[PDB]
């Protein structure tokens, strides 16, 4: 075709990086390039999601479309010196890249074979700060399952209700939930974003300017600046986080976030490498953490805490516990307990927007 454009390296670098974030089919390793109406469009896809970037062409150009190896094109542009100009034109089954006395000839594949995502009806639509979306994902991402046969647990639930957007993730042993207000009347809707979709969502965030989301029956879309991300949803039934929250956890323990984390981390050194079990003895304004491994080694920690309930001893996977404390980044943490065989709820002492549930061990 006639495609031809000349653009500054600096205006092309970040666009290329965002779209080329992926050994599958040959065409899926390629970016779709399109010159049209004073605009260059770069698209990358993996058949389940796609990223589209748009760059303004202020220099002469000729419309056309082709596909080029993404990683190689990105590395070429990033390898060129600061302030370089990059001239691109088509030569048969090849794309010629010129800049200074550097010449590159890349193989292409026809653009007509680049796969198109079907059109879909938007059912929910809202905007919110990037920082809010960042908080929602970071609060729950670590709790997602990995390669679970329950395909639906490998993603993250995105649930709208009233004024709030909510995220939920769980692997069957621990669960994380985080709700934030966005100030818009929203319809109740609940959809599962797949693991790779969550990752790409985070990549396109920086944290005050707006981010526009469109949710459909089977697809989700996010608009940020000159970028548009689209992913297919996971087709399944996500469990109800309301039904796993402990009912009436009357034993409330409060402790220092850092002091409690350091104590658990020291105890974990002598816990079983496979099960990672630690024992918590709770008494009046005191917490005692112990660990034992098969070699009969033993750790013990004693902390001053705020607690006035009945005495109780309960076991836990110390890795799940530390995961929650690393997620909270808190000053004071609050643990709500019931008994030694029931789940526990952990939250920032001064923030209810996020909650964590962890099942004990025997």
């Amino acid at each position: 075709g006639r495609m031809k454009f000349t653009v500054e390296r600096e205006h092309l670098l970040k666009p290329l990086q965002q779209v080329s974030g992926p050994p599958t089919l040959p065409i899926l390793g390629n970016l779709l390039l399109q010159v049209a109406d004073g605009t260059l469009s770069l698209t990358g896809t993996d058949l389940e999601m796609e990223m589209v970037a748009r760059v303004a062409l202020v220099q002469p150009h000729e419309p056309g479309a082709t596909t080029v190896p993404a990683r190689k094109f990105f590395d070429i542009c990033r390898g060129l010196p600061e302030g370089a100009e990059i001239a691109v034109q088509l030569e048969g089954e090849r794309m010629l890249v010129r800049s200074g006395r550097s010449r590159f000839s890349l193989s292409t594949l026809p653009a007509a074979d680049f796969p198109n995502l079907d059109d879909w009806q938007s059912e929910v639509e809202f905007t919110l700060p990037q920082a809010t979306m960042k908080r929602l994902i970071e609060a729950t991402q670590f709790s997602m399952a990995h390669q679970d046969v329950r395909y639906y647990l490998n993603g993250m639930l995105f649930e709208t209700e009233g004024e709030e957007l909510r995220t939920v993730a769980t692997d069957g042993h621990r669960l994380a939930v985080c709700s934030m207000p966005i100030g818009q009347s929203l319809p109740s809707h609940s959809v599962i974003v797949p693991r790779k979709g969550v990752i790409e969502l985070m990549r396109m965030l920086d944290g005050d300017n707006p981010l526009r989301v469109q949710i459909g029956s089977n697809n989700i879309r996010a608009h940020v600046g000159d970028f548009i991300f689209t992913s297919k949803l996971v087709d399944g039934r996500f469990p109800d986080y309301r039904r796993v929250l402990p009912k009436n956890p009357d034993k409330h323990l409060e402790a220092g976030c850092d002091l409690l984390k350091q104590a658990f981390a020291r105890a974990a050194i002598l816990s079983n490498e496979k099960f990672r079990g630690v024992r918590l003895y709770v008494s009046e304004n005191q917490l005692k953490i112990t660990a034992n491994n098969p070699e009969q080694e033993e750790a013990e920690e004693i902390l001053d805490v705020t607690y006035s309930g009945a005495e109780m001893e309960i076991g836990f996977n110390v890795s799940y516990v530390l995961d929650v404390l690393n997620a909270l980044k808190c000053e004071n943490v609050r643990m709500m307990l019931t008994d030694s065989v029931s789940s526990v709820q952990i939250e920032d002492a001064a923030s209810q927007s996020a909650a964590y549930v962890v099942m004990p061990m025997r």
Partner: peptide
């Protein structure tokens, strides 16, 4: 290693 009270799955 008992599980979150999930139906089914636990």
């Amino acid at each position: 290693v008992p599980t979150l009270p999930x139906v089914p799955x636990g």
